[PDB]
């Protein structure tokens, strides 16, 4: 996970999260970051540029993911609403 993410265009014009932003930087890194107008936000809440069959749950309170990042975590209630993903709820529970 936080490494070979979605294309730098994908982000072109955003603000994206810490652990999207660092793997960006690991594998565009902050030069195609910089060019993309790609930069780092926040993290008080599940922020991922979605993936597959990712949608909202917890009340759109935690994003449905294949992997939860460091400022989400494995909500095992909402889980079970997302099917295969795991509902990434803020934190690090």
Not at 71 to 83: K, L, P, R, S
């Amino acid at each position: 996970q936080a490494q070979a993410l979605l294309p730098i265009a994908s982000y072109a014009g955003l603000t994206v999260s810490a652990p999207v932003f660092a793997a960006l930087v690991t594998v565009y890194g902050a030069y195609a970051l910089y060019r993309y107008n790609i930069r780092r936000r926040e993290n008080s809440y599940q922020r991922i540029r979605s993936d597959h069959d990712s949608h909202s749950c917890a009340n759109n309170r935690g994003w449905c993911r294949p992997t939860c990042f460091s400022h989400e975590y494995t909500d095992w209630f909402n889980n079970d609403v997302c099917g295969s993903y795991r509902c990434c709820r803020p934190g690090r529970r």
